[PDB]
């Protein structure tokens, strides 16, 4: 299988080969639109590891989100608060750039469902992602049992609610002492241990 | 590569030990030796260990014999080529300046006793201090015929002020594979006190008292 040789090669990103390819592709992508389509996966081994298949219904969409921090949208930098919240510049978005890229493609192509996104390329002002989406309306996907589940309307806009790999990361949904605040849901956990639970006999 | 350079070290033995023009075919055992090859060359203001490591294999720096231990070894080893020196002698020996110079310039093998390691260090002691020329513990009434290897196999490791040392590796009449095994052991018993090897490697050479143009590290 060529897929193992692809997987191994793609890790060595500063090997003379990938150095060259990074420089020429990042040019090709920058010349196309922001959110444009992709005729095939640029990384067919990475795609299929995340769950892409080469059957009708599955699509790929290339997307480029601006890099850098989140500047607070307050006008003239004036915040109207206490010094602790006078921050404007050094502030970070709590979701990732993968999440922003997933979110904007989800809005563009609303008929399809985001299966999984991933990193392709980056320069100084851009990061380049390829979102694997699925057609929940195409019989091809509705008839196969391994991808029948995605069609169920409890999977509508996974990328928005934050149920994709990126969302689950950004929401710290992981087992262990490390993720005590955010394991079952940060908000659910907060209100549970801020709930005063009284019985009939106290 | 799997016994380092044993393809060219066998050439280094055979194309030296049997030659009358290159190696010059001199008198006696063409005695083969080797220096070291390292990056571990900080001159050591730490005062480098200088540990006298040993192996039962014989380098055989064995021409010049003497004796200091008396009353047993004199009349036990008189059979051998040793020449007995009595107890009232080393005073008259070192009384004139030159006698001790000749002694520690030529006399490179000594036998002592557990009673004659008392009157040793006063006179001879620091007259040389760096010749690497001293006796070793052997009993009064003992083997005497295991000493031929066990004493002269113990050669010296004094590495003070500069990183310039060389531990000799057998000679001609010794075993053929044992010298190419003891070189690897001599690297191992160097990296005993050292920290780096550079790396499972020294810097090969087997000058059998003549070093031709074998240019190996």
């Amino acid at each position: 299988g060529a897929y193992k040789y692809l997987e191994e090669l793609q890790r060595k990103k500063q090997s003379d080969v990938l150095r060259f390819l990074q420089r020429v592709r990042v040019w090709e992508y920058r010349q196309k639109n922001v959110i444009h389509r992709a005729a095939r996966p640029t990384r067919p081994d990475k795609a299929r590891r995340l769950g892409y298949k080469a059957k009708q219904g599955f699509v790929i969409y290339r997307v480029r989100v601006r890099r850098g921090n989140r500047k607070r949208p307050v006008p003239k930098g004036a915040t109207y608060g206490k010094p602790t919240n006078q921050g404007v510049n050094e502030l970070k978005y709590q979701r990732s750039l993968r999440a922003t890229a997933e979110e904007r493609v989800g809005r563009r192509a609303a008929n399809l469902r985001v299966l999984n996104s991933y990193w392709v390329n980056q320069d100084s002002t851009y990061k380049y992602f390829e979102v694997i989406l699925v057609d929940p309306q195409h019989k091809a996907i509705r008839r196969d049992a391994r991808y029948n589940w995605i069609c169920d309307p409890v999977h509508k806009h996974r990328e928005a609610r934050g149920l994709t790999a990126t969302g689950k990361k950004s929401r710290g949904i992981n087992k262990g002492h490390k993720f005590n605040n955010t394991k079952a849901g940060r908000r659910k956990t907060w209100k549970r241990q801020n709930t005063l639970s009284l019985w009939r006999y106290r | 590569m799997s016994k380092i350079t044993s393809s060219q070290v066998r050439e280094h033995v055979k194309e030296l030990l049997k030659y009358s023009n290159e190696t010059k075919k001199r008198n006696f055992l063409e005695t083969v030796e080797l220096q070291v090859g390292l990056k571990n060359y900080d001159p050591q203001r730490d005062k480098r260990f200088s540990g006298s490591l040993k192996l039962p294999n014989c380098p055989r720096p064995n021409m010049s014999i003497c004796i200091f231990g008396d009353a047993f070894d004199v009349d036990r080893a008189k059979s051998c080529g040793v020449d007995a020196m009595s107890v009232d002698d080393l005073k008259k020996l070192n009384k004139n300046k030159k006698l001790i110079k000749k002694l520690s310039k030529k006399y490179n093998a000594f036998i002592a006793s557990e009673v004659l390691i008392k009157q040793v260090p006063r006179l001879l002691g620091p007259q040389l201090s760096k010749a690497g020329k001293f006796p070793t513990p052997v009993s009064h009434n003992d083997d005497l015929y295991g000493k031929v290897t066990d004493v002269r196999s113990t050669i010296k490791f004094q590495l003070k002020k500069v990183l310039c040392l060389a531990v000799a590796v057998g000679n001609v009449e010794m075993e053929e594979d044992v010298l190419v095994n003891q070189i690897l052991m001599s690297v191992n018993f160097f990296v005993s006190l050292l920290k780096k090897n550079w790396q499972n490697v020294g810097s090969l050479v087997v000058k059998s008292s003549m070093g031709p143009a074998f240019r190996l590290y």
């Binding site: 299988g1 897929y3 005729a39 095939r40 | -």
Partner: protein, 174 residues
């Protein structure tokens, strides 16, 4: 080059993978003979077809069963194929970079194949394979160790070529 390529494709024109019709008819004979005689897997004589598909031929090269591997020069993400000449050499299978994945695709009844491989051959046509393997080994296999060292590109546009040729004739050819 376009005469070694022509001859390679003339040998590879035979061992074309069974068509949808030829498959159906062979299956109708076999499946009928499972009833009439009850002699299955001996009827429908052994197929000599070209081996194709990337993950198939990669494994045939890794197992050293391939006798000639054609590597396309215009695969959409080159990375799919960048490793294949180097793998093909290390295993010691004779390989050639041939012009057209479309040309390979037309040979295997697909649109594009990105790779082809002759692992077996008929006794009649082993002589041609042996010759064409020697003539492609002259170009690719033998010279791999040298071509491995040397870079492509770094080539100016025709207008900047003409400018450099002017600015070089300025100083030296004054």
């Amino acid at each position: 080059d376009r005469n070694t390529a022509a001859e390679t494709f003339k040998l590879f024109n035979k061992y074309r993978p069974e068509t949808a019709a030829e498959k159906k008819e062979r299956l109708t004979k076999e499946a009928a003979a499972v009833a009439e005689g009850k002699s299955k897997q001996d009827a429908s004589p052994k197929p000599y077809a070209v081996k194709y598909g990337l993950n198939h031929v990669v494994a045939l090269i890794e197992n050293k069963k391939a006798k000639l591997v054609l590597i396309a020069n215009d695969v959409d993400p080159i990375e799919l194929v960048v490793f294949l000449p180097a793998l093909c050499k290390k295993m010691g299978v004779p390989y050639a970079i041939v012009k057209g994945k479309a040309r390979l695709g037309t040979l295997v009844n697909q649109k594009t194949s990105a790779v082809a491989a002759l692992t077996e051959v008929r006794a009649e046509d082993e002589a041609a394979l042996a010759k064409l393997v020697s003539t492609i080994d002259a170009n690719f296999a033998d010279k791999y160790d040298e071509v491995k060292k040397h870079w492509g590109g770094g080539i100016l546009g025709n207008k900047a070529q003409a400018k450099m040729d002017k600015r070089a004739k300025n100083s030296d050819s004054a």
